[PDB]
Design a protein around this ligand. Structure first.
Ligand SMILES: Cc1cc2nc3c(=O)[nH]c(=O)nc-3n(C[C@H](O)[C@H](O)[C@H](O)COP(=O)(O)O)c2cc1C
Length: 138
């Protein structure tokens, strides 16, 4: 499987690692890719797209790299399964409610409830591993 993410300080990156750990513990392989090093062509062959990005700007996806990437793949992902995650700070998840609505609008099937964790995953570490286990079980 593949996990593509954007992280500004490392919080979403850590969530990605823990989610990968859960998939691996389930007996499956998985690669975590920073959005800047992603190959759209190969990514589109995946059964499930695992995407993560922290809450940026005023409750939006990161604008210079992650957002353009979502727009790029938007026309080629209808019917695909997606799992969404990300770290946030002061809000209550508005950027993720919007991200989920958006992916749904592109024709994707959001397999699990988006996983959002405030700041760094410390107390939420197991939740991250469990999210990975749920995904590897689909
Ligand atoms: C420029 C900027 C804008 C932000 N906007 C939001 C926001 O609208 N809502 C929110 O809850 N957190 C917001 N945050 C906080 C980050 O989502 C939060 O610090 C998160 O843990 C960062 O994860 P990262 O290291 O993966 O990027 C913002 C952070 C920055 C730097």
């Amino acid at each position: 499987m593949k996990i593509v993410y954007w992280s500004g300080t490392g919080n979403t990156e850590k969530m990605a690692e823990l989610i990968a750990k859960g998939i691996i513990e389930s007996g499956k392989d998985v690669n975590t890719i920073n959005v800047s090093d992603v190959n759209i062509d190969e990514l589109l062959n995946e059964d499930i797209l695992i995407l993560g990005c922290s809450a940026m700007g005023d409750e939006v996806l990161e604008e210079s790299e992650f957002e353009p990437f979502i727009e790029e793949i938007s026309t080629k992902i209808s019917g695909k399964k997606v799992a969404l995650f990300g770290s946030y700070g002061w809000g209550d998840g508005k950027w993720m409610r919007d991200f989920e609505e958006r992916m749904n609008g592109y024709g994707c099937v959001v397999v699990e409830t988006p996983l959002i964790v405030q700041n760094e995953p410390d107390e939420a570490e197991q939740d991250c591993i469990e999210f990975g286990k749920k995904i590897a079980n689909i």
